[PDB]
Design a binder for these strands. Structure first.
Length: 8
DNA sequence: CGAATTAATTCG
DNA sequence: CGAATTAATTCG
């Protein structure tokens, strides 16, 4: 995935 | 594993 | 609905 918390 | 990053959740 | 807090994820 990309950096940081995944978008929901 | 930690900081960094990024978004979700909480709570006024 | 926003700022503060919390959480999930990558990279070194």
């Amino acid at each position: 995935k990309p950096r940081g918390r995944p978008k929901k």
